[PDB]
Amino acid sequence: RRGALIVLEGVDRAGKSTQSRKLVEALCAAGHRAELLRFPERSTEIGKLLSSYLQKKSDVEDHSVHLLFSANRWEQVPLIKEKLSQGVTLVVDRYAFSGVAFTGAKENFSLDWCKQPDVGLPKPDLVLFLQLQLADAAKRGAFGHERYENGAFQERALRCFHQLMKDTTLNWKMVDASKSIEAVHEDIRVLSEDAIATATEKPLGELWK
Ligand SMILES: Nc1ncnc2c1ncn2[C@@H]1O[C@H](COP(=O)(O)OP(=O)(O)OP(=O)(O)O)[C@@H](O)[C@H]1O
Ligand SMILES: Cc1cn([C@H]2C[C@H](O)[C@@H](COP(=O)(O)O)O2)c(=O)[nH]c1=O
Ligand SMILES: [Mg+2]
Ligand SMILES: [Mg+2]
């Protein structure tokens, strides 16, 4: 019985990391075998280049950085397939959707070109989108000094996310991320339990193909 592949997406400060940590904790406490993954995975060679870029310690050509973000997902595919095959549900904090939405927010980047590198990745069984007004997301303290940490860019990224949500091949679920940490968590936990129990009857799919 394979594990489910659950992705959490949303703009910066939507609560993705907090909810991904709480979800794994709750699933494990309820007897599931579940583990947390995140993208970018900054521990690899590629992940280190990505981290320097995001921190503005380095500059990288836009197409190149887009391809490094996708390569950082592919390098984890053998691990993802192994874990899911062993029955381990994986909770992923950002995935290909963030990749497309952030690069697609830049000038002269078509959604189509941005999607291609991630075509064929393991297809999530559930994609949770943590919806929150950008204003309230900004009021979750203040902007940091990392790349993309500004309102106009966040708004273009959000528009790209909405284009991706038209894709009916994917099991998108909207989450009202404006509620408390515990209320949002319960919403996410119940959706995840349902996906683990019913979405896994079919083989792992391939993204965007
Ligand atoms: N439901 C919530 N209500 C209020 N604050 C929240 C809520 N969820 C998370 N936060 C707070 O908002 C901040 C950002 O949360 P978190 O790190 O989980 O977001 P994120 O989506 O991972 O952000 P990033 O996009 O930068 O990685 C944290 O200080 C966190 O405690
Ligand atoms: C996974 C991923 C994240 N990003 C961005 C979103 C965030 O602004 C940034 C840091 O992510 P984080 O908010 O998860 O720490 O990286 C990309 O631009 N492309 C990607 O493929
Ligand atoms: Mg985070
Ligand atoms: Mg084509």
Side-chain angles (χ1 to χ4, degrees), residues 3-8 19-29 32-39 76 79-80 82-84 86-93 196:
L5 180 59
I6 297 174
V7 167
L8 284 75
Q19 294 303 331
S20 46
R21 294 187 296 270
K22 291 182 67 65
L23 177 57
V24 173
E25 178 184 32
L27 293 177
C28 287
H32 296 280
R33 293 162 72 207
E35 295 180 35
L36 176 67
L37 287 181
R38 80 304 303 158
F39 292 104
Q76 297 299 325
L79 170 73
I80 289 170
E82 187 178 88
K83 291 279 187 174
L84 298 168
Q86 287 165 347
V88 178
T89 281
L90 298 173
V91 176
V92 190
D93 181 0
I196 293 168

PDB file of all heavy atoms in Angstrom, residues 3-8 19-29 32-39 76 79-80 82-84 86-93 196:
ATOM      1  N   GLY A   3       2.395   5.109  -0.023  1.00  0.00           N
ATOM      2  CA  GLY A   3       2.074   6.329   0.743  1.00  0.00           C
ATOM      3  C   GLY A   3       1.526   7.367  -0.240  1.00  0.00           C
ATOM      4  O   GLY A   3       1.596   7.155  -1.473  1.00  0.00           O
ATOM      5  N   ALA A   4       0.905   8.425   0.291  1.00  0.00           N
ATOM      6  CA  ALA A   4       0.448   9.531  -0.540  1.00  0.00           C
ATOM      7  C   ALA A   4       1.533  10.617  -0.681  1.00  0.00           C
ATOM      8  O   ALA A   4       2.283  10.843   0.254  1.00  0.00           O
ATOM      9  CB  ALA A   4      -0.766  10.209   0.082  1.00  0.00           C
ATOM     10  N   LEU A   5       1.415  11.354  -1.796  1.00  0.00           N
ATOM     11  CA  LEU A   5       2.339  12.479  -2.030  1.00  0.00           C
ATOM     12  C   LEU A   5       1.502  13.725  -1.853  1.00  0.00           C
ATOM     13  O   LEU A   5       0.661  14.017  -2.701  1.00  0.00           O
ATOM     14  CB  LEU A   5       2.951  12.396  -3.436  1.00  0.00           C
ATOM     15  CG  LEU A   5       3.923  13.558  -3.747  1.00  0.00           C
ATOM     16  CD1 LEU A   5       5.089  13.622  -2.785  1.00  0.00           C
ATOM     17  CD2 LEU A   5       4.419  13.373  -5.200  1.00  0.00           C
ATOM     18  N   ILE A   6       1.670  14.434  -0.743  1.00  0.00           N
ATOM     19  CA  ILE A   6       0.874  15.629  -0.429  1.00  0.00           C
ATOM     20  C   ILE A   6       1.759  16.870  -0.490  1.00  0.00           C
ATOM     21  O   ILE A   6       2.798  16.922   0.173  1.00  0.00           O
ATOM     22  CB  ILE A   6       0.338  15.471   1.010  1.00  0.00           C
ATOM     23  CG1 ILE A   6      -0.602  14.244   1.058  1.00  0.00           C
ATOM     24  CG2 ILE A   6      -0.455  16.719   1.415  1.00  0.00           C
ATOM     25  CD1 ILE A   6      -1.054  13.933   2.491  1.00  0.00           C
ATOM     26  N   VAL A   7       1.308  17.811  -1.330  1.00  0.00           N
ATOM     27  CA  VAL A   7       2.056  19.059  -1.444  1.00  0.00           C
ATOM     28  C   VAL A   7       1.328  20.231  -0.829  1.00  0.00           C
ATOM     29  O   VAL A   7       0.101  20.360  -1.040  1.00  0.00           O
ATOM     30  CB  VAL A   7       2.327  19.339  -2.941  1.00  0.00           C
ATOM     31  CG1 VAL A   7       2.824  20.759  -3.198  1.00  0.00           C
ATOM     32  CG2 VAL A   7       3.325  18.310  -3.480  1.00  0.00           C
ATOM     33  N   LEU A   8       2.062  21.095  -0.116  1.00  0.00           N
ATOM     34  CA  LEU A   8       1.493  22.359   0.354  1.00  0.00           C
ATOM     35  C   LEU A   8       2.101  23.522  -0.458  1.00  0.00           C
ATOM     36  O   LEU A   8       3.322  23.623  -0.583  1.00  0.00           O
ATOM     37  CB  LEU A   8       1.753  22.696   1.837  1.00  0.00           C
ATOM     38  CG  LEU A   8       0.876  21.889   2.821  1.00  0.00           C
ATOM     39  CD1 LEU A   8       1.382  20.456   2.929  1.00  0.00           C
ATOM     40  CD2 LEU A   8       0.949  22.562   4.214  1.00  0.00           C
ATOM     41  N   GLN A  19       2.400  24.516   8.656  1.00  0.00           N
ATOM     42  CA  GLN A  19       1.397  23.452   8.463  1.00  0.00           C
ATOM     43  C   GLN A  19       2.036  22.154   8.014  1.00  0.00           C
ATOM     44  O   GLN A  19       1.544  21.077   8.363  1.00  0.00           O
ATOM     45  CB  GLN A  19       0.303  23.946   7.496  1.00  0.00           C
ATOM     46  CG  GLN A  19      -0.558  25.094   8.034  1.00  0.00           C
ATOM     47  CD  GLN A  19      -1.250  24.786   9.349  1.00  0.00           C
ATOM     48  OE1 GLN A  19      -1.563  23.634   9.645  1.00  0.00           O
ATOM     49  NE2 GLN A  19      -1.492  25.783  10.184  1.00  0.00           N
ATOM     50  N   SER A  20       3.141  22.198   7.231  1.00  0.00           N
ATOM     51  CA  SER A  20       3.752  20.926   6.822  1.00  0.00           C
ATOM     52  C   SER A  20       4.350  20.222   8.050  1.00  0.00           C
ATOM     53  O   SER A  20       4.128  19.013   8.180  1.00  0.00           O
ATOM     54  CB  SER A  20       4.874  21.092   5.794  1.00  0.00           C
ATOM     55  OG  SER A  20       5.762  22.117   6.151  1.00  0.00           O
ATOM     56  N   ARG A  21       5.011  20.983   8.932  1.00  0.00           N
ATOM     57  CA  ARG A  21       5.538  20.351  10.152  1.00  0.00           C
ATOM     58  C   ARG A  21       4.436  19.756  11.043  1.00  0.00           C
ATOM     59  O   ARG A  21       4.563  18.606  11.516  1.00  0.00           O
ATOM     60  CB  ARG A  21       6.295  21.372  11.050  1.00  0.00           C
ATOM     61  CG  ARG A  21       7.568  21.886  10.352  1.00  0.00           C
ATOM     62  CD  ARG A  21       8.328  22.737  11.405  1.00  0.00           C
ATOM     63  NE  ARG A  21       7.603  23.912  11.821  1.00  0.00           N
ATOM     64  CZ  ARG A  21       7.659  25.120  11.256  1.00  0.00           C
ATOM     65  NH1 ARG A  21       8.453  25.389  10.213  1.00  0.00           N
ATOM     66  NH2 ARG A  21       6.949  26.078  11.827  1.00  0.00           N
ATOM     67  N   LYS A  22       3.387  20.533  11.244  1.00  0.00           N
ATOM     68  CA  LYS A  22       2.266  20.037  12.074  1.00  0.00           C
ATOM     69  C   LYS A  22       1.572  18.850  11.423  1.00  0.00           C
ATOM     70  O   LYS A  22       1.076  17.999  12.187  1.00  0.00           O
ATOM     71  CB  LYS A  22       1.247  21.126  12.386  1.00  0.00           C
ATOM     72  CG  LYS A  22       1.810  22.213  13.345  1.00  0.00           C
ATOM     73  CD  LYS A  22       0.764  23.259  13.687  1.00  0.00           C
ATOM     74  CE  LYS A  22      -0.418  22.794  14.508  1.00  0.00           C
ATOM     75  NZ  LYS A  22       0.069  22.358  15.881  1.00  0.00           N
ATOM     76  N   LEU A  23       1.476  18.865  10.091  1.00  0.00           N
ATOM     77  CA  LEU A  23       0.795  17.718   9.463  1.00  0.00           C
ATOM     78  C   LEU A  23       1.588  16.431   9.691  1.00  0.00           C
ATOM     79  O   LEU A  23       1.021  15.399  10.063  1.00  0.00           O
ATOM     80  CB  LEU A  23       0.577  17.962   7.973  1.00  0.00           C
ATOM     81  CG  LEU A  23      -0.054  16.811   7.183  1.00  0.00           C
ATOM     82  CD1 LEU A  23      -1.402  16.451   7.811  1.00  0.00           C
ATOM     83  CD2 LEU A  23      -0.153  17.274   5.722  1.00  0.00           C
ATOM     84  N   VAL A  24       2.895  16.442   9.432  1.00  0.00           N
ATOM     85  CA  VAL A  24       3.667  15.210   9.650  1.00  0.00           C
ATOM     86  C   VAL A  24       3.538  14.741  11.097  1.00  0.00           C
ATOM     87  O   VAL A  24       3.361  13.541  11.343  1.00  0.00           O
ATOM     88  CB  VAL A  24       5.132  15.466   9.269  1.00  0.00           C
ATOM     89  CG1 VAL A  24       5.990  14.257   9.638  1.00  0.00           C
ATOM     90  CG2 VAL A  24       5.121  15.733   7.758  1.00  0.00           C
ATOM     91  N   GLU A  25       3.607  15.721  12.019  1.00  0.00           N
ATOM     92  CA  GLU A  25       3.509  15.358  13.437  1.00  0.00           C
ATOM     93  C   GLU A  25       2.192  14.652  13.738  1.00  0.00           C
ATOM     94  O   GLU A  25       2.167  13.608  14.437  1.00  0.00           O
ATOM     95  CB  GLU A  25       3.640  16.663  14.260  1.00  0.00           C
ATOM     96  CG  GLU A  25       3.499  16.427  15.778  1.00  0.00           C
ATOM     97  CD  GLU A  25       3.542  17.779  16.486  1.00  0.00           C
ATOM     98  OE1 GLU A  25       3.109  18.829  15.972  1.00  0.00           O
ATOM     99  OE2 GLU A  25       4.061  17.788  17.621  1.00  0.00           O
ATOM    100  N   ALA A  26       1.101  15.256  13.244  1.00  0.00           N
ATOM    101  CA  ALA A  26      -0.222  14.681  13.522  1.00  0.00           C
ATOM    102  C   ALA A  26      -0.407  13.333  12.867  1.00  0.00           C
ATOM    103  O   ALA A  26      -1.035  12.431  13.483  1.00  0.00           O
ATOM    104  CB  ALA A  26      -1.306  15.669  13.103  1.00  0.00           C
ATOM    105  N   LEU A  27       0.066  13.196  11.641  1.00  0.00           N
ATOM    106  CA  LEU A  27      -0.110  11.892  10.956  1.00  0.00           C
ATOM    107  C   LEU A  27       0.655  10.794  11.690  1.00  0.00           C
ATOM    108  O   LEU A  27       0.136   9.704  11.920  1.00  0.00           O
ATOM    109  CB  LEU A  27       0.370  12.041   9.505  1.00  0.00           C
ATOM    110  CG  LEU A  27      -0.451  12.959   8.611  1.00  0.00           C
ATOM    111  CD1 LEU A  27       0.158  13.110   7.185  1.00  0.00           C
ATOM    112  CD2 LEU A  27      -1.877  12.409   8.389  1.00  0.00           C
ATOM    113  N   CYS A  28       1.893  11.090  12.095  1.00  0.00           N
ATOM    114  CA  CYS A  28       2.705  10.099  12.817  1.00  0.00           C
ATOM    115  C   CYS A  28       2.076   9.736  14.150  1.00  0.00           C
ATOM    116  O   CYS A  28       2.079   8.547  14.527  1.00  0.00           O
ATOM    117  CB  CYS A  28       4.130  10.653  13.016  1.00  0.00           C
ATOM    118  SG  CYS A  28       5.056  10.642  11.461  1.00  0.00           S
ATOM    119  N   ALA A  29       1.455  10.733  14.793  1.00  0.00           N
ATOM    120  CA  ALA A  29       0.831  10.469  16.086  1.00  0.00           C
ATOM    121  C   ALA A  29      -0.402   9.592  15.887  1.00  0.00           C
ATOM    122  O   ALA A  29      -0.831   8.930  16.820  1.00  0.00           O
ATOM    123  CB  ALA A  29       0.523  11.725  16.877  1.00  0.00           C
ATOM    124  N   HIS A  32       0.327   6.863  11.191  1.00  0.00           N
ATOM    125  CA  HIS A  32       0.819   6.776   9.814  1.00  0.00           C
ATOM    126  C   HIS A  32       2.328   6.881   9.805  1.00  0.00           C
ATOM    127  O   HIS A  32       2.964   7.445  10.718  1.00  0.00           O
ATOM    128  CB  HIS A  32       0.318   8.003   9.021  1.00  0.00           C
ATOM    129  CG  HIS A  32      -1.158   8.110   8.863  1.00  0.00           C
ATOM    130  ND1 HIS A  32      -1.835   7.376   7.914  1.00  0.00           N
ATOM    131  CD2 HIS A  32      -2.108   8.801   9.556  1.00  0.00           C
ATOM    132  CE1 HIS A  32      -3.123   7.679   7.936  1.00  0.00           C
ATOM    133  NE2 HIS A  32      -3.294   8.544   8.913  1.00  0.00           N
ATOM    134  N   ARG A  33       2.947   6.308   8.759  1.00  0.00           N
ATOM    135  CA  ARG A  33       4.364   6.555   8.508  1.00  0.00           C
ATOM    136  C   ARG A  33       4.382   7.777   7.552  1.00  0.00           C
ATOM    137  O   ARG A  33       3.832   7.668   6.460  1.00  0.00           O
ATOM    138  CB  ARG A  33       5.026   5.347   7.836  1.00  0.00           C
ATOM    139  CG  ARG A  33       5.082   4.132   8.784  1.00  0.00           C
ATOM    140  CD  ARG A  33       5.315   2.886   7.916  1.00  0.00           C
ATOM    141  NE  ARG A  33       6.692   2.884   7.418  1.00  0.00           N
ATOM    142  CZ  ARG A  33       7.004   2.265   6.272  1.00  0.00           C
ATOM    143  NH1 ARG A  33       6.033   1.671   5.582  1.00  0.00           N
ATOM    144  NH2 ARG A  33       8.265   2.277   5.857  1.00  0.00           N
ATOM    145  N   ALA A  34       4.842   8.917   8.026  1.00  0.00           N
ATOM    146  CA  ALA A  34       4.845  10.117   7.182  1.00  0.00           C
ATOM    147  C   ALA A  34       6.151  10.857   7.431  1.00  0.00           C
ATOM    148  O   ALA A  34       6.632  10.858   8.564  1.00  0.00           O
ATOM    149  CB  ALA A  34       3.667  11.009   7.558  1.00  0.00           C
ATOM    150  N   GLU A  35       6.693  11.506   6.400  1.00  0.00           N
ATOM    151  CA  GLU A  35       7.915  12.257   6.520  1.00  0.00           C
ATOM    152  C   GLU A  35       7.791  13.591   5.748  1.00  0.00           C
ATOM    153  O   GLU A  35       7.022  13.691   4.814  1.00  0.00           O
ATOM    154  CB  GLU A  35       9.130  11.489   5.961  1.00  0.00           C
ATOM    155  CG  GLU A  35       9.388  10.241   6.816  1.00  0.00           C
ATOM    156  CD  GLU A  35      10.595   9.470   6.285  1.00  0.00           C
ATOM    157  OE1 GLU A  35      11.517  10.152   5.805  1.00  0.00           O
ATOM    158  OE2 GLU A  35      10.605   8.225   6.334  1.00  0.00           O
ATOM    159  N   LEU A  36       8.556  14.563   6.238  1.00  0.00           N
ATOM    160  CA  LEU A  36       8.526  15.901   5.634  1.00  0.00           C
ATOM    161  C   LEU A  36       9.645  16.117   4.614  1.00  0.00           C
ATOM    162  O   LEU A  36      10.804  15.764   4.867  1.00  0.00           O
ATOM    163  CB  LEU A  36       8.757  16.848   6.826  1.00  0.00           C
ATOM    164  CG  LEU A  36       8.873  18.334   6.504  1.00  0.00           C
ATOM    165  CD1 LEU A  36       7.520  18.813   5.992  1.00  0.00           C
ATOM    166  CD2 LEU A  36       9.274  19.123   7.756  1.00  0.00           C
ATOM    167  N   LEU A  37       9.340  16.726   3.478  1.00  0.00           N
ATOM    168  CA  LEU A  37      10.318  17.129   2.466  1.00  0.00           C
ATOM    169  C   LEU A  37      10.054  18.601   2.163  1.00  0.00           C
ATOM    170  O   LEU A  37       8.986  19.147   2.512  1.00  0.00           O
ATOM    171  CB  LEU A  37      10.126  16.396   1.142  1.00  0.00           C
ATOM    172  CG  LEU A  37      10.541  14.924   1.133  1.00  0.00           C
ATOM    173  CD1 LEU A  37      10.295  14.397  -0.286  1.00  0.00           C
ATOM    174  CD2 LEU A  37      12.001  14.828   1.520  1.00  0.00           C
ATOM    175  N   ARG A  38      11.071  19.317   1.641  1.00  0.00           N
ATOM    176  CA  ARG A  38      10.785  20.696   1.278  1.00  0.00           C
ATOM    177  C   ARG A  38      11.609  21.094   0.028  1.00  0.00           C
ATOM    178  O   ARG A  38      12.652  20.490  -0.206  1.00  0.00           O
ATOM    179  CB  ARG A  38      11.111  21.744   2.339  1.00  0.00           C
ATOM    180  CG  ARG A  38      12.575  22.120   2.418  1.00  0.00           C
ATOM    181  CD  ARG A  38      13.421  20.883   2.646  1.00  0.00           C
ATOM    182  NE  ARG A  38      12.980  20.211   3.870  1.00  0.00           N
ATOM    183  CZ  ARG A  38      13.221  18.915   4.106  1.00  0.00           C
ATOM    184  NH1 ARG A  38      13.867  18.158   3.222  1.00  0.00           N
ATOM    185  NH2 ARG A  38      12.774  18.402   5.248  1.00  0.00           N
ATOM    186  N   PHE A  39      11.045  22.014  -0.735  1.00  0.00           N
ATOM    187  CA  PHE A  39      11.827  22.550  -1.867  1.00  0.00           C
ATOM    188  C   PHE A  39      11.855  24.051  -1.718  1.00  0.00           C
ATOM    189  O   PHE A  39      10.885  24.732  -1.381  1.00  0.00           O
ATOM    190  CB  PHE A  39      11.212  22.060  -3.184  1.00  0.00           C
ATOM    191  CG  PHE A  39      11.387  20.585  -3.348  1.00  0.00           C
ATOM    192  CD1 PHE A  39      10.352  19.699  -3.142  1.00  0.00           C
ATOM    193  CD2 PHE A  39      12.659  20.101  -3.691  1.00  0.00           C
ATOM    194  CE1 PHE A  39      10.568  18.324  -3.259  1.00  0.00           C
ATOM    195  CE2 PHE A  39      12.858  18.732  -3.799  1.00  0.00           C
ATOM    196  CZ  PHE A  39      11.823  17.839  -3.607  1.00  0.00           C
ATOM    197  N   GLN A  76      15.745  14.501  -6.095  1.00  0.00           N
ATOM    198  CA  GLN A  76      15.066  13.798  -4.992  1.00  0.00           C
ATOM    199  C   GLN A  76      14.073  12.773  -5.479  1.00  0.00           C
ATOM    200  O   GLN A  76      13.407  12.058  -4.693  1.00  0.00           O
ATOM    201  CB  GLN A  76      14.362  14.852  -4.124  1.00  0.00           C
ATOM    202  CG  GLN A  76      15.277  15.858  -3.439  1.00  0.00           C
ATOM    203  CD  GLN A  76      16.248  15.171  -2.488  1.00  0.00           C
ATOM    204  OE1 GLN A  76      15.887  14.185  -1.853  1.00  0.00           O
ATOM    205  NE2 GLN A  76      17.463  15.680  -2.406  1.00  0.00           N
ATOM    206  N   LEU A  79      14.423   9.023  -4.263  1.00  0.00           N
ATOM    207  CA  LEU A  79      14.048   8.966  -2.846  1.00  0.00           C
ATOM    208  C   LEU A  79      12.529   9.034  -2.668  1.00  0.00           C
ATOM    209  O   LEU A  79      11.960   8.269  -1.871  1.00  0.00           O
ATOM    210  CB  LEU A  79      14.705  10.102  -2.047  1.00  0.00           C
ATOM    211  CG  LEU A  79      14.171  10.245  -0.613  1.00  0.00           C
ATOM    212  CD1 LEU A  79      14.693   9.098   0.233  1.00  0.00           C
ATOM    213  CD2 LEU A  79      14.552  11.584   0.001  1.00  0.00           C
ATOM    214  N   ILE A  80      11.889   9.969  -3.359  1.00  0.00           N
ATOM    215  CA  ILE A  80      10.445  10.096  -3.283  1.00  0.00           C
ATOM    216  C   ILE A  80       9.745   8.823  -3.702  1.00  0.00           C
ATOM    217  O   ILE A  80       8.790   8.351  -3.074  1.00  0.00           O
ATOM    218  CB  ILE A  80       9.965  11.271  -4.197  1.00  0.00           C
ATOM    219  CG1 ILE A  80      10.397  12.581  -3.533  1.00  0.00           C
ATOM    220  CG2 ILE A  80       8.477  11.204  -4.447  1.00  0.00           C
ATOM    221  CD1 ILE A  80      10.171  13.758  -4.494  1.00  0.00           C
ATOM    222  N   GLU A  82      11.019   5.800  -3.793  1.00  0.00           N
ATOM    223  CA  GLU A  82      11.330   4.711  -2.852  1.00  0.00           C
ATOM    224  C   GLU A  82      10.424   4.829  -1.620  1.00  0.00           C
ATOM    225  O   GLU A  82       9.700   3.875  -1.286  1.00  0.00           O
ATOM    226  CB  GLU A  82      12.796   4.744  -2.487  1.00  0.00           C
ATOM    227  CG  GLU A  82      13.262   3.557  -1.636  1.00  0.00           C
ATOM    228  CD  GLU A  82      14.759   3.683  -1.377  1.00  0.00           C
ATOM    229  OE1 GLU A  82      15.141   4.341  -0.395  1.00  0.00           O
ATOM    230  OE2 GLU A  82      15.548   3.140  -2.184  1.00  0.00           O
ATOM    231  N   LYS A  83      10.422   6.022  -1.014  1.00  0.00           N
ATOM    232  CA  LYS A  83       9.561   6.168   0.171  1.00  0.00           C
ATOM    233  C   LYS A  83       8.096   5.856  -0.066  1.00  0.00           C
ATOM    234  O   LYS A  83       7.457   5.133   0.728  1.00  0.00           O
ATOM    235  CB  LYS A  83       9.714   7.613   0.695  1.00  0.00           C
ATOM    236  CG  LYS A  83      11.106   7.830   1.270  1.00  0.00           C
ATOM    237  CD  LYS A  83      11.234   7.298   2.680  1.00  0.00           C
ATOM    238  CE  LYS A  83      12.600   7.710   3.248  1.00  0.00           C
ATOM    239  NZ  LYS A  83      12.643   7.304   4.686  1.00  0.00           N
ATOM    240  N   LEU A  84       7.515   6.425  -1.125  1.00  0.00           N
ATOM    241  CA  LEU A  84       6.101   6.174  -1.386  1.00  0.00           C
ATOM    242  C   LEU A  84       5.887   4.665  -1.588  1.00  0.00           C
ATOM    243  O   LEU A  84       4.903   4.118  -1.082  1.00  0.00           O
ATOM    244  CB  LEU A  84       5.582   6.940  -2.613  1.00  0.00           C
ATOM    245  CG  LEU A  84       5.643   8.464  -2.553  1.00  0.00           C
ATOM    246  CD1 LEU A  84       5.357   9.002  -3.973  1.00  0.00           C
ATOM    247  CD2 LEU A  84       4.667   9.064  -1.537  1.00  0.00           C
ATOM    248  N   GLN A  86       7.317   2.275  -0.237  1.00  0.00           N
ATOM    249  CA  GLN A  86       7.440   1.588   1.044  1.00  0.00           C
ATOM    250  C   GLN A  86       6.249   1.866   1.962  1.00  0.00           C
ATOM    251  O   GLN A  86       6.285   1.413   3.124  1.00  0.00           O
ATOM    252  CB  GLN A  86       8.711   2.023   1.755  1.00  0.00           C
ATOM    253  CG  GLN A  86       9.980   1.450   1.141  1.00  0.00           C
ATOM    254  CD  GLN A  86      11.247   2.124   1.584  1.00  0.00           C
ATOM    255  OE1 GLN A  86      11.245   3.204   2.189  1.00  0.00           O
ATOM    256  NE2 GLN A  86      12.374   1.498   1.254  1.00  0.00           N
ATOM    257  N   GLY A  87       5.341   2.693   1.508  1.00  0.00           N
ATOM    258  CA  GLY A  87       4.152   3.030   2.298  1.00  0.00           C
ATOM    259  C   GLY A  87       4.265   4.319   3.100  1.00  0.00           C
ATOM    260  O   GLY A  87       3.442   4.581   4.011  1.00  0.00           O
ATOM    261  N   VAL A  88       5.329   5.076   2.843  1.00  0.00           N
ATOM    262  CA  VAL A  88       5.549   6.304   3.605  1.00  0.00           C
ATOM    263  C   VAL A  88       4.880   7.469   2.903  1.00  0.00           C
ATOM    264  O   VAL A  88       5.180   7.667   1.717  1.00  0.00           O
ATOM    265  CB  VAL A  88       7.044   6.632   3.709  1.00  0.00           C
ATOM    266  CG1 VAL A  88       7.234   7.942   4.478  1.00  0.00           C
ATOM    267  CG2 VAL A  88       7.800   5.477   4.356  1.00  0.00           C
ATOM    268  N   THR A  89       3.981   8.168   3.554  1.00  0.00           N
ATOM    269  CA  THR A  89       3.330   9.349   2.980  1.00  0.00           C
ATOM    270  C   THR A  89       4.304  10.516   3.086  1.00  0.00           C
ATOM    271  O   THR A  89       4.995  10.692   4.102  1.00  0.00           O
ATOM    272  CB  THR A  89       2.037   9.667   3.761  1.00  0.00           C
ATOM    273  OG1 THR A  89       1.070   8.725   3.250  1.00  0.00           O
ATOM    274  CG2 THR A  89       1.541  11.087   3.518  1.00  0.00           C
ATOM    275  N   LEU A  90       4.443  11.298   2.010  1.00  0.00           N
ATOM    276  CA  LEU A  90       5.407  12.399   2.051  1.00  0.00           C
ATOM    277  C   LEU A  90       4.611  13.710   1.995  1.00  0.00           C
ATOM    278  O   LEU A  90       3.730  13.885   1.152  1.00  0.00           O
ATOM    279  CB  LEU A  90       6.353  12.364   0.841  1.00  0.00           C
ATOM    280  CG  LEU A  90       7.230  11.125   0.746  1.00  0.00           C
ATOM    281  CD1 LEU A  90       7.975  11.150  -0.595  1.00  0.00           C
ATOM    282  CD2 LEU A  90       8.233  11.086   1.895  1.00  0.00           C
ATOM    283  N   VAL A  91       4.945  14.567   2.937  1.00  0.00           N
ATOM    284  CA  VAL A  91       4.379  15.915   3.031  1.00  0.00           C
ATOM    285  C   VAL A  91       5.432  16.895   2.531  1.00  0.00           C
ATOM    286  O   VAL A  91       6.488  16.921   3.153  1.00  0.00           O
ATOM    287  CB  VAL A  91       4.027  16.224   4.501  1.00  0.00           C
ATOM    288  CG1 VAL A  91       3.516  17.682   4.589  1.00  0.00           C
ATOM    289  CG2 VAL A  91       2.909  15.283   4.934  1.00  0.00           C
ATOM    290  N   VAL A  92       5.147  17.557   1.433  1.00  0.00           N
ATOM    291  CA  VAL A  92       6.139  18.410   0.736  1.00  0.00           C
ATOM    292  C   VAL A  92       5.784  19.874   0.823  1.00  0.00           C
ATOM    293  O   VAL A  92       4.743  20.329   0.312  1.00  0.00           O
ATOM    294  CB  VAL A  92       6.156  17.923  -0.733  1.00  0.00           C
ATOM    295  CG1 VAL A  92       7.344  18.584  -1.448  1.00  0.00           C
ATOM    296  CG2 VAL A  92       6.287  16.401  -0.744  1.00  0.00           C
ATOM    297  N   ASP A  93       6.717  20.667   1.358  1.00  0.00           N
ATOM    298  CA  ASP A  93       6.586  22.105   1.526  1.00  0.00           C
ATOM    299  C   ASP A  93       7.162  22.814   0.303  1.00  0.00           C
ATOM    300  O   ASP A  93       8.393  22.926   0.248  1.00  0.00           O
ATOM    301  CB  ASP A  93       7.356  22.424   2.811  1.00  0.00           C
ATOM    302  CG  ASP A  93       7.348  23.872   3.233  1.00  0.00           C
ATOM    303  OD1 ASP A  93       6.741  24.761   2.571  1.00  0.00           O
ATOM    304  OD2 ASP A  93       8.081  24.145   4.237  1.00  0.00           O
ATOM    305  N   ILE A 196      -4.822  10.003   1.947  1.00  0.00           N
ATOM    306  CA  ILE A 196      -4.005   8.844   2.265  1.00  0.00           C
ATOM    307  C   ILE A 196      -4.843   7.563   2.108  1.00  0.00           C
ATOM    308  O   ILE A 196      -4.357   6.573   1.558  1.00  0.00           O
ATOM    309  CB  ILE A 196      -3.458   8.897   3.693  1.00  0.00           C
ATOM    310  CG1 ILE A 196      -2.454  10.065   3.754  1.00  0.00           C
ATOM    311  CG2 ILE A 196      -2.818   7.576   4.063  1.00  0.00           C
ATOM    312  CD1 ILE A 196      -2.078  10.398   5.206  1.00  0.00           C
TER     313      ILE A 196
END
